[PDB]
Amino acid sequence: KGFSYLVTATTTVGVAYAAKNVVSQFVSSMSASADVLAMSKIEIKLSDIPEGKNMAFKWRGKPLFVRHRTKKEIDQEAAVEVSQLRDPQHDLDRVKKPEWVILIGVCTHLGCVPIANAGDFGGYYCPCHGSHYDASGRIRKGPAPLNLEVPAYEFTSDDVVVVG
Amino acid sequence: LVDPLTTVREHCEQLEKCVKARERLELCDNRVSSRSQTEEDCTEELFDFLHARDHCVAHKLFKNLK
Amino acid sequence: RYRELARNWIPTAGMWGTVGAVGLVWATDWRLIL
Amino acid sequence: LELHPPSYPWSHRGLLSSLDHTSIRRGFQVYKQVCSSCHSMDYVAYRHLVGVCYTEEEAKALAEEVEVQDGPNDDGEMFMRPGKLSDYFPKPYPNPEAARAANNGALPPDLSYIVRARHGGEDYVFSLLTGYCEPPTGVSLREGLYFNPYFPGQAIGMAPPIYTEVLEYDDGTPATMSQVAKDVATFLRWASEPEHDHRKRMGLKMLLMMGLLLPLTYAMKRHKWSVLKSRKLAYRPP
Amino acid sequence: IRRGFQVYKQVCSSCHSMDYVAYRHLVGVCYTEEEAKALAEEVEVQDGPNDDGE
Amino acid sequence: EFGNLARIRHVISYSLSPFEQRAFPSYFSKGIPNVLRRTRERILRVAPPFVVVYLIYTWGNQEFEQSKRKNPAMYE
Amino acid sequence: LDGFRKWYYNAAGFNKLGLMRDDTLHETEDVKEAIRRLPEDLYNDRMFRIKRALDLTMRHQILPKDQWTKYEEDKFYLEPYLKEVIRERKEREEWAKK
Amino acid sequence: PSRLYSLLFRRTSTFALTIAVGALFFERAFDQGADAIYEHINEGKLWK
Amino acid sequence: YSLLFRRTSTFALTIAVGALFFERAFDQGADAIYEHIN
Amino acid sequence: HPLFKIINHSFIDLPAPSNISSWWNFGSLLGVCLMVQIITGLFLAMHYTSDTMTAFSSVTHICRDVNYGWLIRYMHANGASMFFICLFLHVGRGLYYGSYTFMETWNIGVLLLFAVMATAFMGYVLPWGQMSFWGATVITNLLSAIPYIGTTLVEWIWGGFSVDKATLTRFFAFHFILPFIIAALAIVHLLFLHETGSNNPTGLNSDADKIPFHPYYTIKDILGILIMFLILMTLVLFFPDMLGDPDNYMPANPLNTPPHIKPEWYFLFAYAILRSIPNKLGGVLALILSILILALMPFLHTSKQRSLMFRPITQILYWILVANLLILTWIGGQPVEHPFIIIGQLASISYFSIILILMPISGIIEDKMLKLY
Amino acid sequence: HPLFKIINHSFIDLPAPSNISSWWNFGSLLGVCLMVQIITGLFLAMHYTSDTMTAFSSVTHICRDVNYGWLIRYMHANGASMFFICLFLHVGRGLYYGSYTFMETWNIGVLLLFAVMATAFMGYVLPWGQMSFWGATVITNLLSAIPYIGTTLVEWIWGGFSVDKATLTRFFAFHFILPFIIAA
Ligand code: HEC
Ligand code: HEM
Ligand code: HEM
Ligand code: HEM
């Protein structure tokens, strides 16, 4: 009896392997295709954004927000202390250079385009649910869970910032 | 060439209800201007007057126009 | 009487969960989990 | 917070009131002479006009009026042909950037579906085009802006494009700013729904057919259901 | 395959078109990432999204 | 199916042919009274929730407007 | 409390359609059992009552007021039986746990 | 009229036949009528 | 039989576990064979 | 004949209760609406192109040059709206008359409701307007709630970093394929019901009074089909844009976002609940429960009477439930600001407390009033 | 259980002849092939675009950039070939063993055969290659043979003067929708 049962256990094992490989293929197929994957390409000109301006680049589909900040934004941003800061992040740790603020550009509250310079704290604002982001892109008021993600920007130079 | 709208806006403003509104706005205007350190604008005040004027114009503009 | 019945299946039930769980980790190819 | 354009007694508003089709003619003239410099009616082609306010041959005239160069050429990378009936309306500023460049970085939205895309469009359009009033105290529009109480934010890059007698209507109807805004709102409306008239005719036939068919089907149902609705039950225990 | 890609690059590329094959496809087949990056940087392309540059 | 649905006894059931009866007998004659009879028996259970929905909706609208109203003390 | 009850009664309406409380008990397994045990007369009577109700509902109509049930007249025909079904049901259950 | 029933409705096929013919003609009338009604309704606002 | 072939539950466990390992093993051997052929 | 056996039995002689009102028409209307949607959807599929390159235009071409193509497109959109109207009234009939005690039929129903909501969501994404793109991103990111499984899953559906062509094409495939699964699930829905037969508004055993279906509830379904067709066409041919949104007539701009974004009317009640819960995850869960609470409904029936025809206190609680469902539909529309938020929070609290707590307690009280408890 | 009763009634306790050979497997294979085709077809539909400018580009994108997309595409094509192999052997079994005396089953079969041939024809038109376009024109032209209404019918199907995008898109819709009718 054991032998017969052993035979099927073996057969079942092989089948598991079979089923495992196939499903993975389909999910991966639906999963990011090469082309999608091959989009991390990104480059930007710093000189493109004058101080206190939000610039769009839509890198990786997400409308990239490469923003610049005004004197107030560049300087007062640090005044947020920490308790005053809704999130635990640091305003400047978000920017190699304070004036140039680089962020993904999607308010964490279920996704949307942050409206820069509009809102209660000013600096960014999610019209969809009223999330107000400071110039640092840190969620200060509203229901947005976390600060705007800051991409891996490369400050190659002061006139051209190339995330990648 | 008299744009019917022009005339209509006249009659409409002449409406007393509308008249009272404009007054309020002007107060705001001067108040805003007089106030030195402020940011309140009469836009909201302007907005309210318009709604009425426009509604009135709505009642008498289309027909005037050809 | 019910307690006895429950006792009998408690271990086997865990066995079943374990069976699926073993395959689960495998199927999920989760390296994080087992 | 935005001014909400009032309801105007637009002629086409009536349940069975078709678009003037006489006014539209005027409105387009307004788009061709004023609005086509910045905005693009991408989804409306000359052929579309035939049957609404311009006849086949007549449309052919307008089509030829403009010039359209297509790249495919035997050796050349283009060949310029006066627009044919099939050609779509000519969009200026080929790339949007072109538009932004000259429009203070503000893209003139295609006015093809503007009326459909703008809440209360027909009204909005009229209001915006005619809402170019004086900016109030405290307002500080940025360079290259104008003041319209309706436009979202009240800061539309578009400068006021309709000055009384901006263009002359071929029909001769006095070209007052309003007469021009009403005509272009009717036209843009037509643009956003070329089938407005045809549909309303279908709706009239539908109302007549349902007014015929609903009491008759109700009568058939009440025939078949009368039998039961008259059934008298009686309990007669022995 | 690497030698045959060279041939196209030099002799048959000027008149025929390998449209459905991109510099990305070569990585892990004939060239490394940096070699294919250098090969790609050897042919300029057109983007034309400039404020005015089209 | 029919025949095995239920067991009743001594319940006689009279009926008439469709073509032998008027189509809408006393339709508006008793229909109106009945419809009105019906509305009475259900209006107190149905209507007051929708009445207070109307009051809450209006209230919300007006309250919202007042909320949008500028504080007199604002910027002064 | 009778006032309340009688009032609720008229409010429920089951009276209007010539139906006693019992006539309106969902046919759960137990209720069904009791129904079967019902002496034939009550059963046949129950049926006419229910059939009549159905007909009236069909026409969205109610019986003439006079024919309406009366809070007092209403008798609970199944109650005595139903209890038994529940009692027996529970007994078997406890015994199961034994 | 009994004639109608006796001739047009009695035979199921005729019942259909009459319906068929009626349909063939109804369109003409309804279309034209509604068209004109519509035309009159929007008497002046049209392409013409 | 007395461990994985007595009751369905036991049988199930071995299947899951064995399949878990066979997968990698199969690929590994295939590596050799595939490389062997090429 | 084997087929005719299935036919006559199921569609002609099905012993049906004689006293079921017009509400029992609605489910048949849903089936008709399904067929209508499928037919109109097929005639949208002969000219639509999933490419993000030509989507907007494909649709424009549909409403501009495709013969009567505007008619088929607006029939499809307003037929989706009519589908959700008939679906909500069907679910309300099931809640009011105690039809959830047919538990298998109810569970196949709530599966059908989930499938129909997913189909309508992806279909609304399909024209690739401004509103479609921001709507897709938004509740897709909703899926980004799950901590470990969520993020990847989102991009998995997005098929990339952010919704883009990858999504549109797979959403076209899924929106095409799900109504046939809905039709198969509706066949299972009809089967699980004929085993038990339909319910009647009195909630009693209608075995003593059953009539055929062919001449009695067929002409009734035909009349209901005619009335539903009157409302649809008069919502397409005269008021075609009433239920839609104007910002969907703009092309999808990833750089801009429609200032005022809202789900379509039918998905609002849920939207309100989601917005109400402060925690993102909480919102997602509550949202799901909003629909799922129904499935949970057959285990909450504590009354000895099936229907609410003879139950006035639970009738009052039911109409209060319909009332704050309408309130949640309104709130979703309203923007985020006082006092819309508080109403939303209460309305959600009242919704869950009426379904979970108040109705079984009221049924116990009603059983106590009839000297049953 | 009313759902498990049908499944039991058709697959578990169904009384089958004890001596049926391997040929009786083939019809079940056809059902499996149908699913397989549907599943592979669904995973072709998440990346295929029915536009004449982009159909060949989408097929090459499936083969070159989608992870295991070449696998699903060639599984779909060779599964159509396997479907017709199993279909021909199923019909040959029915002809050889006298199974056509089940007349209703045979007629539903030949309806299924017509539907499968139409589905495979439009599916072969779908990749918009050289061979697909000339093949489509050819068979669409077949219809023109009709004595009186032929020209109209051809033009209808084509949706224009000659097969062009109008056809491709409606052929995508029909090729999508017919295997579910085949399943019913
Ligand atoms: C010579 C230039 C010019 C003319 C003439 C012109 N426009 Fe514009 N229009 C613009 C520019 C630039 C913008 C972009 C402004 C912005 O986006 O803020 C614009 C934007 C608009 C918008 C977008 C408003 C919104 O809701 O976002 C509408 C509507 C509009 N124009 C209507 C018209 C109509 C209607 C006419 C004539 C009947 C007209 N325009 C003529 C330059 C023009
Ligand atoms: C298999 C049958 C169906 C097919 C082939 C189909 C096909 C399509 C296509 C091609 C579109 C894009 C057209 C456009 O939106 O501009 C679309 C849109 C849509 N479909 Fe479907 N559909 C089907 C069934 C359904 C069903 C059952 C529903 C309802 C649940 C539905 C709801 C929608 C909605 C809401 C839209 C968007 C309407 C809009 O543009 O605002 N469809 N459908
Ligand atoms: C669009 C999807 C649906 C379709 C097409 C559908 C169709 C039907 C049909 C045709 C019936 C036969 C009885 C009748 O129509 O009155 C029915 C009964 C029923 N459905 Fe649905 N249904 C759907 C969704 C639902 C949902 C979501 C629920 C649960 C909320 C539900 C609950 C029921 C119940 C309880 C019955 C039995 C009611 C009775 O006959 O007394 N259905 N359905
Ligand atoms: C609903 C199920 C199906 C779907 C969704 C579907 C979908 C598709 C799609 C998108 C294509 C074009 C891309 C490609 O596969 O090459 C295609 C091609 C094709 N399909 Fe289907 N299909 C289905 C069922 C079938 C069936 C049942 C058959 C067999 C009769 C079939 C035979 C083909 C063939 C021969 C091609 C051309 C393959 C090639 O490009 O070389 N398909 N199918």
The first and second tokens of residue B23, run together, are 């007054």
**Residue K156, Cβ neighbours under 10 Å: how many?**
12
- Tell me whether D235 touches chain G (CB under 8 Å): yes
Q: How far is CA H17 from CA H13, H22, H27, in A?
A: 6, 8, 16
Min Cα distance C9 → chain I (Å) is: 11
Cα separation of J282 and J288, whole Å? Answer: 10
Cα separation of J340 and J361, whole Å? Answer: 30
**Greatest extent of chain C over all pairs of C-alpha atoms, in Å:** 43
Three-state secondary-structure class, residue J16:
strand
Q: How far is CA D14 from CA A95, D210, I18, in A?
A: 58, 20, 75
Cα separation of D42 and D107, whole Å? Answer: 14
DSSP designation for A49:
S
Q: Which residues contact J184 (CB under 8 A, 6 or more apart)?
A: none
Q: How far is CA D230 from CA F15, F35, K53, in A?
A: 6, 18, 68
The first and second tokens of residue K118, run together, are 């139409």
**Residue E37, Cβ neighbours under 10 Å: how many?**
13
The candidate with the shortest Cα–Cα distance to J300, out of J250, J252, J355, is: J355
Q: Which atom of ligand 3 is nearest to the CA of J91?
A: 30
Min Cα distance C3 → chain G (Å) is: 9
State which of K46, K76, K88, K113 you would mutate to test the pocket of ligand 4, scoring each by most atoms of that ligand within 8 A of its C-beta: K76
**Owner of token pair 């002799």:** E11
> Does the annotation place J76 within a ligand binding site?
yes
**Residue C9, Cβ neighbours under 10 Å: how many?**
11
The first and second tokens of residue D158, run together, are 């578009």
The candidate with the shortest Cα–Cα distance to K75, out of K38, K112, K125, K115, is: K38
**Residue J108, Cβ neighbours under 10 Å: how many?**
21
Q: Are D237 and F15 in contact (CB under 8 A)?
A: no
D70 beta partners:
D79
Domain map of chain C by residue range? 1-34
Cα separation of A85 and K124, whole Å? Answer: 61
Nearest CA in chain K to J166: K47
The ligand that comes nearest to the alpha carbon of residue K180 is 4
Three-state secondary-structure class, residue E12:
helix
Q: Are J201 and J309 in contact (CB under 8 A)?
A: yes
- Tell me whether D27 touches chain B (CB under 8 Å): no
Q: Are D133 and D140 in contact (CB under 8 A)?
A: no
Which of D1, D227, D231 comes nearest F18 by C-beta?
A: D227
Helix (H) or strand (E) holding A124: strand A124-126
> Does the annotation place A128 within a ligand binding site?
no
Q: Which amino acid is at J106?
A: W
D235 beta partners:
F11
The first and second tokens of residue G64, run together, are 């003439």
Question: What is the sign of the dihedral through the CA atoms of E34, E35, E38 and E43?
Answer: negative
Experimental method: cryo-EM
For chain J, the chains sharing at least 3 beta-carbon pairs closer than 8 angstroms are: A, D, F, G, K
Q: What are the backbone angles phi and psi of residue J23, rounded to the nearest 5°?
A: -60, -35
Q: Are J132 and J126 in contact (CB under 8 A)?
A: yes
How would you list the strands of the sheet with A65-68, edge to edge?
A: A54-56, A65-68, A100-103
- Tell me whether D216 touches chain G (CB under 8 Å): no
> Does the annotation place J61 within a ligand binding site?
no
Nearest CA in chain E to K62: E20
Burial of I35 by CB count in 10 Å (0-12 exposed, 13-18 middle, 19+ buried)? exposed
Q: Are J327 and J345 in contact (CB under 8 A)?
A: no
DSSP designation for A134:
-
The ligand that comes nearest to the alpha carbon of residue J91 is 3
The candidate with the shortest Cα–Cα distance to B61, out of A97, D182, J65, K122, is: D182
Burial of J288 by CB count in 10 Å (0-12 exposed, 13-18 middle, 19+ buried)? middle
Pocket of ligand 2 (CB under 6 A): J 34, 37-38, 41-42, 44-45, 48, 59, 73, 76-77, 80, 83, 116, 119-120, 123-124, 126-127, 175-176, 179, 244
**Owner of token pair 């399943």:** K183
D88 beta partners:
D45
Burial of D215 by CB count in 10 Å (0-12 exposed, 13-18 middle, 19+ buried)? exposed
> Which residue intervals of chain A are DSSP H helices?
2-30, 34-37, 71-76
The ligand that comes nearest to the alpha carbon of residue K168 is 4
Q: Are J175 and J57 in contact (CB under 8 A)?
A: no
Which of F10, F26, F28, F64 to substitute to test the interface with D, most D CBs within 10 Å? F10
Three-state secondary-structure class, residue A61:
coil
DSSP chain H: -HHIIIIIISSHHHHHHHHHHHHHHHHHHHHHHHHHHHHHHTSSSS--
Which of K39, K47, K67 comes nearest A31 by C-beta?
A: K67
How many residues belong to chain A?
164
Reply yes or no on whether A68 is catalytic. Answer: no
Cα separation of K176 and K41, whole Å? Answer: 8
> Which residue intervals of chain K are DSSP H helices?
4-11, 26-45, 55-64, 69-96, 103-125, 130-144, 150-158, 165-183
Three-state secondary-structure class, residue A68:
strand
- Tell me whether E25 touches chain K (CB under 8 Å): yes
Helices A2-30 + K26-45 axis angle, to 10: 30
Helix (H) or strand (E) holding J231: helix J218-233
Q: Are J255 and A58 in contact (CB under 8 A)?
A: yes
**Owner of token pair 């079904």:** G85
Which of J196, J200, J204 to substitute to test the interface with G, most G CBs within 10 Å? J204
Q: Are K75 and K36 in contact (CB under 8 A)?
A: yes
Q: How far is CA J214 from CA D225, F72, J21, J25, in A?
A: 12, 71, 16, 14
A30–J137 CB contact, under 8 Å: no
Q: Which residues contact A160 (CB under 8 A, 6 or more apart)?
A: A43, A44, A45, A46, A47
CA–centroid distance, D108 to ligand 1, in Å, is 5
The first and second tokens of residue J47, run together, are 């000219």
Which of I4, I7, I10, I15 to substitute to test the interface with A, most A CBs within 10 Å? I15
CA–centroid distance, J40 to ligand 2, in Å, is 8
The candidate with the shortest Cα–Cα distance to D160, out of D130, D122, D181, D134, is: D130
**Greatest extent of chain G over all pairs of C-alpha atoms, in Å:** 55
- Tell me whether A19 touches chain I (CB under 8 Å): no
Cα angle vertex D45, ends D41, D47, to 5°?
155
Nearest CA in chain A to J143: A110
Pocket of ligand 3 (CB under 6 A): J 24, 27-28, 30-31, 34, 87, 90-91, 94, 99-100, 102, 105-106, 109-110, 112-113, 116, 186, 189-190, 193, 198-199, 294
Q: What are the backbone angles phi and psi of residue H22, rounded to the nearest 5°?
A: -60, -45
F50–J319 CB contact, under 8 Å: yes
Q: Please report residues of D whose CB lies closer than 8 A to that of E54.
A: 94-95, 97-98
Cα separation of J343 and J159, whole Å? Answer: 37
The candidate with the shortest Cα–Cα distance to A137, out of A82, A75, A89, A83, is: A89
> For J347-352, which contacts have Cβ atoms below 8 Å and span 24 or more sequence positions?
J347/J272, J347/J276, J348/J272, J348/J273, J348/J276, J348/J277, J348/J286, J350/J320, J350/J324, J351/J273, J351/J290, J351/J321, J351/J324, J351/J325, J352/J286, J352/J289, J352/J293
Cα separation of J196 and J190, whole Å? Answer: 10
Cα separation of J290 and J329, whole Å? Answer: 13
> Which residue intervals of E1-54 are DSSP H helices?
2-7, 23-26, 33-40
J203–G26 CB contact, under 8 Å: yes
Q: How far is CA K35 from CA J296, K116, K146, in A?
A: 34, 13, 35
Q: Provide the annotated active-site residues of J.
A: 194, 198, 220-221, 264
Q: Is D109 left (phi over 0), alpha (psi -120 to 50) or beta?
A: beta
A65 beta partners:
A56, A103
* CA A27 to the chain's CA centroid: 24
**Residue D200, Cβ neighbours under 10 Å: how many?**
22
